Every structure is written in C-alpha cells, then in structure tokens.
C-alpha cells in the first residue's frame, strides 16, 4: 500500500500560521475525518460500520414535527456563504445544497457532485417517516453512508436545527417547487 | 487582447532591475535550468535545489534569490503577495514573465531525488486530507470526471489526464472576475478559503507540496501562458 | 500511490487502428467501466451507491411474465460465441454463463469465476419475485453489485429480452436440469 | 518430438540471410545484449533502446533492425505476422530461434530508465482497464488465484509469482490445435479477440506495455522454449 | 513494491519450524483468511458477498435453545488464555471478549477494538430471535461482516457450542450484569 | 536508574573480544556504515548487504559477522537468544550496545534496492496476514488509532505517524515485568505468541521483513535507547 508520510502533520502545522481566533480547530481532524482521509473515502466494511455507529449517536432530532418552512429552506439551499476567513462577522451560513444537487426542477444553476433531488418528497409519497430520515441525512450524512462527500451540517454546527427543518420542508413539502 | 501581458512586461523590467543591498538584478538567479536561464524553467518546477536542500516552487525560489543574490528584504512581499486596487504585485509580474518563457513547452517534473519523492507524497496526502467544518478535501471537488459545482465544471486533478494537463498548462492566468492576473499561490489560497480552512502561508511547504503533486498529474500539458479565465 | 500515466489513452488510440464499422465504441469506456478500472473493482461506498443507482434506471423489464423457455435458455448459457472480430456476421451471441458458473449439476464443464448456481430456482422456492430479481441481474449485474465481474448483458446489447427471459427460465423453471 | 524446433531452425537461417536494399543479414542487430549477441537477449526484453529512445519488445526490435540495418521494407511482415497453412512467418521463425538462445536463462527485466518505468505503468493500466461489450479486463480472468473459465485453468498474472513465471517462461510455444508456433504477439491478439475488443495493431505500443508488465511479474522464471501447449 | 504470495507462504514455512504437537495446521490459511489478508480486510463488493455466503453456510445452530448459563458465560468473556505456545496442556480457552468489548458496565478493564456491548440484551428487549442472531455472530462473525477482525470462535474450534451458548446468555440474560 | 546500561557495557566488551576458531573480535563487522562504524548503524537497519545478497536486520547481520569473521558457530545463540535467570544473552547485549550508538539519531531506512522493496512488501503482507485459530493479524491490534486491548493502549503501526515513530525509537528496551532488556526479536516472538501462532525461529526472514516494514513507518523517529517500559 501507498502510505502518507508522517511529516504531513508538521507541514500543516507550520504552513497555516495566521489563525483566526479558535481556527486551529479547523486544522485538527476528528476521528471520522482522519479515517476518511487515510482510506481515501473507502473504509473497510468494519471501519464503515464503526463510522456509521459513531455518527448516528450524535444526531439530535427535533422535539416535535420535522418539517419547517420550505420558503426558508429554499434560502438555506441557495446560500453558499458562511464560515470562510473572508466572511464578515454575522454572516448567515448556508447549506449550499445547489452546489451539489438538483432540487427545484425549474432552477437551472445546480451542481452534479451529488444525486438529483427533484421530487424527493413526492417519490416518497411525502412520508413523515422518510422526512425524519432526510433530517438525519442533513444532520450527519455519514451516519448512513461512511465517508460521504456531503458535509455533516448538523454535527459540525454549520446549520441550526431550524435551518435543517426548513431545508427538509424544501424536500418534502407538497407545495415546495422541488415537488412541483 | 490579453491583459496578462501587462504583467509579463512588468516582470521583464523587474528581472533586469538592480535592487536590494547588493544592488544587482535577478539575472543570475538559478530557476533550475542554470543561473539566468529562463526558457523551460517554469515547465520543470517545483524541483529540488542543492543550494537550499529543499524542493521549491517558482515563488519560493524567487524569494530566496531576492534575499541571497540581491539582499532585498522579502518580508513586505510575503505580507502582500497578491495585487489589488492600486497595488501591483512584483511576484505576479515576475511569475507572468517567467512562465511566459515556457510558453509552448510541455510540463515535466522529474521526481529524481528522495526530497522530490517525499514532497510529492506530502502533496498527495494534502490533496485527500478532509478537515474543517464542511469536511472538504481537494478530492471532494476534484476527485471525479465530468462533475460540476453549480455551473462551474470541475477538473479532475487526482489522476493524470487531459483535465490536469489543461489546468496546470493554463496558470498563471488573468481572472476576468478579479481584474487581475493570479498565480497558483493565489489559486491554492482561494481553494483553501472556500474549504473553510485558514489561509495557507504564502510560499509555504504545503503549497509547494500540492503544486508538485498537481504539476506531476499535468505532465505533457503544453503551457499556454498567461491564460484568461 | 501509483497512478495510470495520461499516455494510456493515446497508447490505446494509436495501437488499435483497424476498426470494424462502429467498433470505436469498443475502445471508449463508459463512466462505470472507468470507475471500476481505476478502483480495481473496489469502489468507495459513495461510488458504489452511485453506480448501482445509475445502472438500475437503465434496466428494461418485460411487459408480461419474466420466464421464457428453459430449453432455449440452456442454449444461451452454453454459447460462448458472438461479438468477436473473428465471428462472421449473423453469429448469434450467447451469454457464456457456463464460463463462470456451475449451473446444471450434471454439466462438468463449468468455470469458477462466479458462484455456483445449482438449484438456483429451487433454493428460492421458485419465487416469481426472485425470478424478476434474476432478470435484473442478467440485464445489468452492476445495478445490484457495484463493479461485478459479470458482463452487463442487456444494457450492453449482448443479449435480447427473449434470450434473458430464456436464461432466467433455465435458472427458475422447476423442469430445468438446474433445478433437478 | 517438438515441432517448434522446425521454426527454430528456419529462424537460424533467416538470421544469417542477406536481405534488403543494403543486402546484409541480421547478424549485427542489437537485441539489447550488444550487436549480434543472442544468448540471454529474449530473457531481458522488453527494454529501452537508446537509438530509438523507445521501449521495445523483440518483434518491434526485429522490425526496426530490418528497416535500419537491412533496408528491408517491413510492410509485408506487419501485414501478415502469423503463419497459416502453406505460408510461414519470418517473425515467428526468428522469435523461435532467438527465444531458444535464452533457453535455461532466468527472466529479468530491469526497470532502469524513466521510459521503462512509464511503459510498465501503462501495461499495468491496460491490464486493469475494463472495456467493450462484455466489460472485460485482463484482470477479470487473470486477477485472482486458482480460478478457471470452463475447464481452462487461469493463471494469476497481476502479482509476481509462480503463475506468471510459468506463463512467460513458456512462450513462444507450439499450439497443438493450431499446428503452429505462436508468439506473445499472437497471444495478446487472441486475448483481445476473446474480450470482444478490436484486434491490436501488430508490434504496437499497447502490446509492448502489456508484455513488459507480464514479463516483470515473471521475473526469475527459467525459460523453456519453444514450449508445447 | 509487490511480492509473490507463494513467497510469503514460503517465508512463513521457513520462519516457523518449532511446531508443538498438533500445531502444524496453524500456519495454514483457509480461503476467507487468504482473501482478507490480500485485501487488507477491505474486500471488493463481489469478494465481500462471496465471503459472507461461504461463512453463513458453516454456522451450526444448537438443537434446542441458544441461551446457556450467564455465569459460565462471564468466565468465557474474562478468560484471555488458551491456545498459546506457552499455555500448559489442559488450559481452557476463553473468548477473551473483554479484550475488545465493554460488557458489564461495572467492569473497568475492557478494550475498545470492538463496539460496546453494554445492555446488549436489554437494548433488544431480550428477543429470543436476537439471541439466535448473536449466537451466529459469535459462531462466525464473518457471516455478517466480511473480514471482521472478531475471531470466528465456533467455526475455528476455539469455543464449544456450550461456551457460545453461555456467552450468549452473558449478553442476553436479564440477570446478567451486562443488562443491569 | 536504567538497568539496560548493564547490557550496553557487556556488549561493549563483546564487540572487542576475540572469539571463534579464527580468534578475532567483531571490530571489523560492517553493519552497513562501513566496517567497524557503529554510529548511526541501528538507525539505518534493516538493509541490503551486497556481500550476502540479502536484506538483514541487526541480529541477522551480527550472526553472519560472527560466522564469517570470527568463525564462531551461531547455533547456540539461535537456540537460546533471550536472557533468563542466571544466563545472559550475547545478542541482547550487542544489540543494546550498538543501538545506543544511534541514540539521538533519526530512523531512516531506504528502499534503495529491489531486494529491500521486495522485503518491505513481504513485511506488509505479514502484517496483514490473517493467521491461525483466532484469525488474528498484526493489523487486528495495531491497525487503528487510539484503541486499546483491555487497558493496554495500542500503537497504530499500519501507517507512518507518531505511534510508529515512538515505538521503533524505543527498542531495545528494559522490560520491567520481565526484569530483562529485550530486543525487537523478542517483541515479535511475544506478539506471535499472543496471536496463537507458533514461536518464530530467531533471526528468521519473517521477523526481518516485519522489522523493515515497521522501521519504514517509524521514519524520522529519534532513537532513545535503551528505553524502559
Ligand atoms: C444542503 C443542506 C443539502 C441537502 C438538503 C442535501 N445535500 Fe447532499 N449528498 C451529496 C452526495 C455525494 C450524496 C450521495 C452520497 C450519500 O448518500 O451520502 C448526497 C446525498 C444526499 C441525500 C440522500 C439522497 C438519496 O440517496 O436519497 C439528500 C436527501 C441530500 N444529500 C440532501 C453531496 C452534497 C454536497 C457536496 C459537497 C453538498 C453541499 C450537499 N450534498 C448538500 C446537501
Ligand atoms: C484543495 C486544497 C484544492 C486544491 C489544491 C484545488 N482545489 Fe479547487 N476549484 C473549485 C472550483 C468551483 C474551481 C473553479 C473551476 C472553474 O470554473 O474553472 C476550482 C479551481 C481549482 C483550480 C483551477 C482549475 C483550472 O482549470 O484553472 C485548481 C488548480 C484547484 N481548484 C485546486 C472547487 C473546489 C472545491 C469545492 C467545494 C474544493 C473543496 C476545492 N476546489 C479544493 C481544491
Ligand atoms: C449468463 C447469461 C449468466 C447468467 C444467467 C448469470 N451469470 Fe453471473 N456472476 C458472476 C459473478 C463474479 C457474480 C457474483 C457477483 C455479483 O453478484 O454480481 C455473478 C452473479 C450472478 C447471479 C447472482 C448469484 C447469487 O449468488 O445471487 C446470477 C443469477 C448470475 N450471475 C447469472 C460472473 C459471471 C461471468 C464472468 C465473466 C459471466 C460470463 C456470467 N456471470 C454470466 C452469467
Ligand atoms: C488482456 C489483454 C489479457 C491479457 C494480457 C492476457 N489475458 Fe488471457 N487467457 C484466458 C484463457 C482461457 C487462456 C488460456 C489458459 C490455458 O491455456 O489454461 C489465457 C491465456 C493467457 C496467457 C497465456 C497463459 C499461458 O500459460 O500460456 C496470457 C499471457 C494471457 N492470457 C494474458 C482467458 C482470458 C480472459 C477470459 C474472458 C480474458 C478477459 C483474458 N484472458 C485477458 C487477457
Ligand atoms: C467473545 C466470545 C466475544 C463476543 C461474545 C463478542 N465479541 Fe466481538 N466484535 C469485534 C469487532 C471489531 C466487531 C464489529 C465488527 C463486526 O460486527 O463484526 C464485533 C462485533 C460483535 C458483536 C455485534 C455487535 C453489534 O454491532 O451488534 C457482538 C454481539 C460481539 N462482537 C460479541 C471484535 C472482537 C474481538 C477483537 C479481537 C474479539 C476478541 C471479540 N470481538 C470477541 C467477542
Ligand atoms: C504481528 C506479528 C504483530 C506485530 C509485528 C506487532 N504486534 Fe503487538 N502488541 C500488543 C500489545 C498488548 C502490546 C504492548 C503495548 C505496550 O506495551 O505499550 C504490543 C506491542 C507491540 C510492539 C511494541 C510497541 C511499543 O510501543 O513498544 C510492537 C513492535 C508490536 N506489538 C508489533 C498486542 C498485539 C495483538 C493483540 C491480539 C496482536 C495480534 C499483535 N500485537 C500483533 C503484532
């Protein structure tokens, strides 16, 4: 096997020396990040099982109903700002779903890193059970697919619970353009 | 038709202009093809240099030449390496001029030393390293063929191929949206920025390691520089 | 990691210059062939999920019943001809199932590249639901197992719908020697 | 008891027969061991040749020698490289003769140049490349141990080892059902045929690359040629 | 960097020439061990499928119930001895479950190679069906997760049927400290 | 308070003491840095030696030196390589002495030859080899980060990094619970014991191969030996 040289950590720690307050945590990998790096997103069946387990426990579901406002979910999906060293303080962070996914069939600017999500709710018969599954996917994608390329929005603090509820309504609400 | 030639012209003046405590020009700087030899040099960087014992990319080597040959203090350059409103960059200008001296030359980096082999392996590790709050690695966006983020087509950079050849053969480049010529140092800075990572230090080992990795994937690409994007 | 030189494509283009009409298609890889080649048939969980999804939508099921004639299926299984540059026009293509699989327990000439299929229908209590899954398998193996070594017979046009219905009958008919 | 020696003997005659516009034999052809030196040559091919700057297998090398030493036009040989009823192949006879001058010699290809390393890597990529209407690669049938296709045992060729040593140490070979001696060029042609691929061009780069990959897997195998299969 | 796997076998055979009575067999690998070794426990989808199918067939279920004595099961779990060239003749082999797993929440000496099994039975509502699944998991962990690093206790002859029944009772009996 | 220095002292005497039929010391033994040259030697082992055509770890090289320089038969030391109550080990003592001459030196083995590259590959296979009645491989226990077996923390040894660097930079070591200085040969014997494998033959090829694999992962580790554990 190819191996990454040990010197990589030193290279990182000495190449990123201008650090915003607290940002050294951005250089520090958590356990899942580390395994997905070493295995190049292809963990063994055992490793994949371990990842999925560790990630599922971290998901925090809402107290009541999962669906929020699809109108506000549209904004989450369209916004790709937030979290960058260049973003002003107070910048609202987006999910940038459109960066990777087709969502509203009428929106022509969409990426293809991930699967098309057109009619996501409708093809699931608007199931409340499936909405909860979608909530979980957005909250921590790696709970159901080890080393997924999708960001773990809920667990990493990129999206709030309300924002996740809202984007879930963008997928599942029968009056969302996604389902029309 | 290509505003990148304004940088080329300024770089040519800078190359021959006496500066620093020694009051000499950059004309005897060895960029890997022998002291002063410009043709083909960009096409064969990064590379190992015996005098420093390090693998260096173009901008690192230029800073080292400024210091050792000219006695020119590089600290203000490293502080402000990218041009902006009312401020040109000596680094962008020199890089434009030097890269253009490799125009039409095919990219070839030889991993002919243990240092070069090691930096290449470090670059590969950096390319697949997932970190920060979106869990991104370069490979998230550049690890597959024929994908796009919104309406921006993404080149596959993880393996040798046409995508890698075309990308590396077209830097440095005038970026229309920025009204500036930008170098690979800036592209790496911008990539890391969008991965929600802190800014890499200018002329750092991580940037040279990633550059060496990418340039190896780009072997065979015919340089057409400066480009426009 | 060791990676394929870019020159590979150019070596192919210039080493295969006598081409039967249309056989240029044969030199070019589709996306699934490309992923399976570079991962050496071990795709990541994310890549496997994408391949299975892309392949599943390509499957064309028969309008009516799935089972054909087992006697004609026996012929599809035994036939290793067709599709080669030396095969004269009009050559009927077989599935060459025996190349890789045990099928009729009395047939001693069978390969081991694939699993034993002896009693395939009987094991599954001759289920019609399992027959349809088998149709899908023969039509496009990669819809259900990413980077399978089994050729994609239906999608690649190697076998017709009737031949696939016939070979499914060879697997599932209680009168098939496979099941006796 | 081995009809392949009929080919060996005809190749011996050809080696010493003046041909071409220069009207000379092939006796000064360099097959890697020095001009005219036969013993051990086949065991050490494919390899890099400085005069062409290419990595070359035996058949490619024989064609170049005919063209440059002999001034013999090779279009006829390339057009019909494989023998058939009532028509012998100069290429098969020369290969029989030359390979037999390595009988008892252990296979050893050194990857001593960047060109050999690259050709080896191209061979490895071709070996795992899935294509055409059955989706086959070489590795489909030759990537695991102890498998068979119908009742034909399959050698594992993707790792160094006994299977590869025994395969490559036994070509060229008399093929009983064909009543002809065949070379590695014919084996590759027949392999590609069975994968539902177009015929490879005779003495093409693809075949050399694959030959080098396999020969490196076969290192240490003691040649016993011509064989009978 | 590649090697002949026959060379590796040869290296083993010439590096291990002091063999106890009845231990020559220990240098052998079965096909599952061999495949897991060459793939570094990351088999392709196709190989994983073949492993699980070959292993599932080897599982021998008890005649009657699968729960034994939890107190005896506790001993199987705590015992890390047996089968070692330094063990005296007559040494009872254990499962050494604690080497890899948290079990009794009150036991501080446990390993982390495997998942926590705290309250395993209670989590599953003491299901007799789940008890049979755990019997199978302990008998041959690879029947359900290809290349698992958990030993195949039943299939390799490390634990008797009674021992596995006993350790299943340690996991599933309501009175086991595991479930308190 | 480090009893391992008692071994170091005894090995110093042994290095210079005439022995064997040829009645000479080990002073002219080449450990890879030139005959008699001790400093740095342990840091660069295992390695290929031209004079044997073999990759050898320190203990194998010592046994060979003893054979060909001293004419001292090495069968007695192979039978009983590990010290015990009332009996010291010449091997443990020489290894302590020689390893300590690399105290403060960074670990660096180079895969310079085909033989070292092959040995590494054997080592890697041995590390992942699922073996014997519990199916254990080295990677069962040393394949993951931050894990433990009962309350024994396990170093990850399958990838380069701090764990591998710390482990290899701290053997040989005084093992408190055994009241003895032990070498990597003993650690391997101990590991194989716990894997339910038979005892490996002392100075066997298997142990050399695993040692090279591990030492490569530990590249850059600073030796501080003899240690205490
Ligand atoms: C913005 C908050 C979103 C939302 C609402 C979704 N995504 Fe992604 N996603 C990506 C990839 C590669 C996959 C497939 C791999 C995997 O399953 O993990 C997905 C998957 C999904 C799903 C499940 C679709 C299905 O199979 O049923 C859903 C519901 C979903 N996503 C929603 C990749 C990305 C990104 C690449 C960097 C980004 C950004 C997003 N996803 C963002 C979002
Ligand atoms: C990890 C540090 C990296 C590195 C080394 C690179 N990328 Fe990216 N990248 C992204 C997008 C949208 C673009 C613009 C594409 C276009 O419109 O042409 C790029 C561009 C690059 C380039 C230049 C390519 C060219 O053809 O000129 C290079 C050399 C490059 N990147 C390297 C998107 C992303 C990401 C999306 C979330 C991620 C993550 C990265 N890039 C990461 C990196
Ligand atoms: C000729 C048309 C056939 C038919 C009727 C089948 N095969 Fe194959 N097959 C191969 C391999 C490696 C597998 C296992 C991996 C996977 O599941 O894709 C299979 C699988 C099957 C099945 C499913 C068996 C099961 O256990 O569930 C069936 C019903 C089946 N095949 C039928 C390999 C090959 C070949 C290798 C080159 C070829 C040719 C075929 N199969 C051909 C056929
Ligand atoms: C992809 C281009 C390749 C290459 C480079 C090789 N093979 Fe095959 N092969 C197959 C069968 C049935 C045989 C005969 C085996 C026997 O007689 O027992 C072979 C033979 C070879 C050889 C010669 C082996 C020998 O010992 O003489 C070589 C060098 C070789 N192959 C290389 C079957 C297949 C396939 C079945 C579908 C596929 C695909 C390939 N081979 C592909 C290739
Ligand atoms: C001693 C007899 C035992 C018993 C009773 C169990 N184990 Fe293990 N185990 C290990 C690992 C890495 C896993 C996860 C991968 C896999 O699922 O194969 C497991 C799994 C289990 C389970 C299933 C847990 C679940 O997810 O529901 C159970 C019930 C179980 N084990 C019981 C690792 C190890 C070891 C590493 C060397 C050893 C020893 C054991 N297990 C021993 C035992
Ligand atoms: C397969 C032959 C191997 C090899 C080459 C190694 N191990 Fe193990 N190991 C285990 C335990 C509990 C220890 C003690 C750790 C400590 O005392 O801190 C070790 C130790 C080692 C070392 C030394 C580590 C150090 O820091 O000094 C080395 C080099 C080593 N091992 C190599 C446990 C296990 C196993 C549990 C069942 C298995 C299997 C192995 N080890 C296998 C191997």
PDB file of C-alpha atoms in Angstrom, chain A residues 37-150:
ATOM      1  CA  UNK A  37      -8.533  10.717   4.749  1.00  0.00           C
ATOM      2  CA  UNK A  38      -6.304   7.671   5.316  1.00  0.00           C
ATOM      3  CA  UNK A  39      -8.671   5.330   3.436  1.00  0.00           C
ATOM      4  CA  UNK A  40      -9.380   7.879   0.659  1.00  0.00           C
ATOM      5  CA  UNK A  41     -13.120   7.614   1.415  1.00  0.00           C
ATOM      6  CA  UNK A  42     -13.058   3.842   1.024  1.00  0.00           C
ATOM      7  CA  UNK A  43     -13.180   2.312   4.527  1.00  0.00           C
ATOM      8  CA  UNK A  44     -13.304  -1.456   5.112  1.00  0.00           C
ATOM      9  CA  UNK A  45     -16.701  -2.982   5.921  1.00  0.00           C
ATOM     10  CA  UNK A  46     -15.627  -2.970   9.639  1.00  0.00           C
ATOM     11  CA  UNK A  47     -14.437   0.639   9.549  1.00  0.00           C
ATOM     12  CA  UNK A  48     -17.577   1.764   7.727  1.00  0.00           C
ATOM     13  CA  UNK A  49     -19.721   0.079  10.410  1.00  0.00           C
ATOM     14  CA  UNK A  50     -17.776   1.876  13.173  1.00  0.00           C
ATOM     15  CA  UNK A  51     -18.090   5.279  11.451  1.00  0.00           C
ATOM     16  CA  UNK A  52     -21.813   4.906  10.913  1.00  0.00           C
ATOM     17  CA  UNK A  53     -22.334   3.877  14.532  1.00  0.00           C
ATOM     18  CA  UNK A  54     -20.291   6.769  15.978  1.00  0.00           C
ATOM     19  CA  UNK A  55     -22.057   9.238  13.770  1.00  0.00           C
ATOM     20  CA  UNK A  56     -25.675   8.034  14.338  1.00  0.00           C
ATOM     21  CA  UNK A  57     -25.447   8.627  18.116  1.00  0.00           C
ATOM     22  CA  UNK A  58     -24.599  12.300  17.522  1.00  0.00           C
ATOM     23  CA  UNK A  59     -27.817  13.129  15.657  1.00  0.00           C
ATOM     24  CA  UNK A  60     -30.226  15.292  17.631  1.00  0.00           C
ATOM     25  CA  UNK A  61     -33.792  15.123  16.268  1.00  0.00           C
ATOM     26  CA  UNK A  62     -36.306  17.980  16.853  1.00  0.00           C
ATOM     27  CA  UNK A  63     -38.784  17.638  19.751  1.00  0.00           C
ATOM     28  CA  UNK A  64     -41.915  17.896  17.588  1.00  0.00           C
ATOM     29  CA  UNK A  65     -42.563  17.776  13.800  1.00  0.00           C
ATOM     30  CA  UNK A  66     -39.545  17.676  11.470  1.00  0.00           C
ATOM     31  CA  UNK A  67     -40.875  19.980   8.720  1.00  0.00           C
ATOM     32  CA  UNK A  68     -40.236  23.730   8.868  1.00  0.00           C
ATOM     33  CA  UNK A  69     -40.743  26.415   6.209  1.00  0.00           C
ATOM     34  CA  UNK A  70     -39.954  25.418   2.616  1.00  0.00           C
ATOM     35  CA  UNK A  71     -39.602  29.132   1.676  1.00  0.00           C
ATOM     36  CA  UNK A  72     -36.835  29.449   4.273  1.00  0.00           C
ATOM     37  CA  UNK A  73     -35.399  26.050   3.195  1.00  0.00           C
ATOM     38  CA  UNK A  74     -35.038  27.425  -0.340  1.00  0.00           C
ATOM     39  CA  UNK A  75     -32.789  30.131   1.131  1.00  0.00           C
ATOM     40  CA  UNK A  76     -30.647  27.571   3.032  1.00  0.00           C
ATOM     41  CA  UNK A  77     -30.237  25.579  -0.184  1.00  0.00           C
ATOM     42  CA  UNK A  78     -29.292  28.661  -2.271  1.00  0.00           C
ATOM     43  CA  UNK A  79     -26.849  30.229   0.177  1.00  0.00           C
ATOM     44  CA  UNK A  80     -23.195  29.215  -0.138  1.00  0.00           C
ATOM     45  CA  UNK A  81     -21.788  31.875   2.170  1.00  0.00           C
ATOM     46  CA  UNK A  82     -20.588  31.434   5.761  1.00  0.00           C
ATOM     47  CA  UNK A  83     -17.606  30.014   7.636  1.00  0.00           C
ATOM     48  CA  UNK A  84     -14.868  31.403   5.339  1.00  0.00           C
ATOM     49  CA  UNK A  85     -11.986  33.581   6.638  1.00  0.00           C
ATOM     50  CA  UNK A  86     -13.299  36.246   4.267  1.00  0.00           C
ATOM     51  CA  UNK A  87     -16.900  36.306   5.530  1.00  0.00           C
ATOM     52  CA  UNK A  88     -17.749  39.329   7.756  1.00  0.00           C
ATOM     53  CA  UNK A  89     -18.918  38.631  11.331  1.00  0.00           C
ATOM     54  CA  UNK A  90     -22.638  37.848  11.498  1.00  0.00           C
ATOM     55  CA  UNK A  91     -22.731  36.231   8.020  1.00  0.00           C
ATOM     56  CA  UNK A  92     -25.537  33.655   7.979  1.00  0.00           C
ATOM     57  CA  UNK A  93     -24.186  30.280   6.872  1.00  0.00           C
ATOM     58  CA  UNK A  94     -25.952  28.384   4.104  1.00  0.00           C
ATOM     59  CA  UNK A  95     -26.276  24.702   3.256  1.00  0.00           C
ATOM     60  CA  UNK A  96     -25.196  25.353  -0.359  1.00  0.00           C
ATOM     61  CA  UNK A  97     -27.269  22.321  -1.440  1.00  0.00           C
ATOM     62  CA  UNK A  98     -27.460  23.649  -5.023  1.00  0.00           C
ATOM     63  CA  UNK A  99     -23.664  23.412  -5.185  1.00  0.00           C
ATOM     64  CA  UNK A 100     -24.036  19.628  -5.373  1.00  0.00           C
ATOM     65  CA  UNK A 101     -27.689  18.757  -6.047  1.00  0.00           C
ATOM     66  CA  UNK A 102     -30.531  19.416  -8.472  1.00  0.00           C
ATOM     67  CA  UNK A 103     -33.538  20.490  -6.265  1.00  0.00           C
ATOM     68  CA  UNK A 104     -36.179  22.732  -7.858  1.00  0.00           C
ATOM     69  CA  UNK A 105     -36.634  21.307 -11.422  1.00  0.00           C
ATOM     70  CA  UNK A 106     -37.040  24.920 -12.679  1.00  0.00           C
ATOM     71  CA  UNK A 107     -33.679  26.092 -11.243  1.00  0.00           C
ATOM     72  CA  UNK A 108     -31.002  25.716 -13.945  1.00  0.00           C
ATOM     73  CA  UNK A 109     -27.960  26.521 -11.803  1.00  0.00           C
ATOM     74  CA  UNK A 110     -27.243  23.302  -9.930  1.00  0.00           C
ATOM     75  CA  UNK A 111     -24.263  21.010  -9.433  1.00  0.00           C
ATOM     76  CA  UNK A 112     -23.762  17.296 -10.001  1.00  0.00           C
ATOM     77  CA  UNK A 113     -21.393  16.172  -7.247  1.00  0.00           C
ATOM     78  CA  UNK A 114     -24.426  14.626  -5.624  1.00  0.00           C
ATOM     79  CA  UNK A 115     -27.629  12.921  -6.862  1.00  0.00           C
ATOM     80  CA  UNK A 116     -30.596  14.877  -8.254  1.00  0.00           C
ATOM     81  CA  UNK A 117     -33.155  15.545  -5.571  1.00  0.00           C
ATOM     82  CA  UNK A 118     -36.005  16.600  -7.843  1.00  0.00           C
ATOM     83  CA  UNK A 119     -39.341  15.408  -6.497  1.00  0.00           C
ATOM     84  CA  UNK A 120     -37.578  13.967  -3.425  1.00  0.00           C
ATOM     85  CA  UNK A 121     -40.754  14.154  -1.272  1.00  0.00           C
ATOM     86  CA  UNK A 122     -43.220  13.201  -3.981  1.00  0.00           C
ATOM     87  CA  UNK A 123     -41.452   9.944  -4.931  1.00  0.00           C
ATOM     88  CA  UNK A 124     -41.525   9.028  -1.226  1.00  0.00           C
ATOM     89  CA  UNK A 125     -45.303   9.739  -1.032  1.00  0.00           C
ATOM     90  CA  UNK A 126     -44.496  12.644   1.370  1.00  0.00           C
ATOM     91  CA  UNK A 127     -43.821  10.085   4.111  1.00  0.00           C
ATOM     92  CA  UNK A 128     -43.347  11.563   7.617  1.00  0.00           C
ATOM     93  CA  UNK A 129     -41.043   8.599   8.286  1.00  0.00           C
ATOM     94  CA  UNK A 130     -38.908   9.482   5.255  1.00  0.00           C
ATOM     95  CA  UNK A 131     -38.763  13.169   6.285  1.00  0.00           C
ATOM     96  CA  UNK A 132     -37.149  12.100   9.572  1.00  0.00           C
ATOM     97  CA  UNK A 133     -34.655  10.053   7.581  1.00  0.00           C
ATOM     98  CA  UNK A 134     -33.886  13.184   5.492  1.00  0.00           C
ATOM     99  CA  UNK A 135     -33.483  15.213   8.667  1.00  0.00           C
ATOM    100  CA  UNK A 136     -30.891  12.683   9.790  1.00  0.00           C
ATOM    101  CA  UNK A 137     -29.110  12.786   6.396  1.00  0.00           C
ATOM    102  CA  UNK A 138     -28.740  16.522   6.525  1.00  0.00           C
ATOM    103  CA  UNK A 139     -27.748  16.459  10.206  1.00  0.00           C
ATOM    104  CA  UNK A 140     -24.959  13.881   9.633  1.00  0.00           C
ATOM    105  CA  UNK A 141     -24.642  12.284   6.249  1.00  0.00           C
ATOM    106  CA  UNK A 142     -22.032   9.807   7.420  1.00  0.00           C
ATOM    107  CA  UNK A 143     -24.470   8.167   9.810  1.00  0.00           C
ATOM    108  CA  UNK A 144     -25.950   6.373   6.743  1.00  0.00           C
ATOM    109  CA  UNK A 145     -23.040   6.402   4.254  1.00  0.00           C
ATOM    110  CA  UNK A 146     -19.484   6.164   5.577  1.00  0.00           C
ATOM    111  CA  UNK A 147     -17.128   8.844   4.209  1.00  0.00           C
ATOM    112  CA  UNK A 148     -19.880  10.567   2.183  1.00  0.00           C
ATOM    113  CA  UNK A 149     -18.680  13.797   0.454  1.00  0.00           C
ATOM    114  CA  UNK A 150     -21.687  15.651   1.881  1.00  0.00           C
TER     115      UNK A 150
END
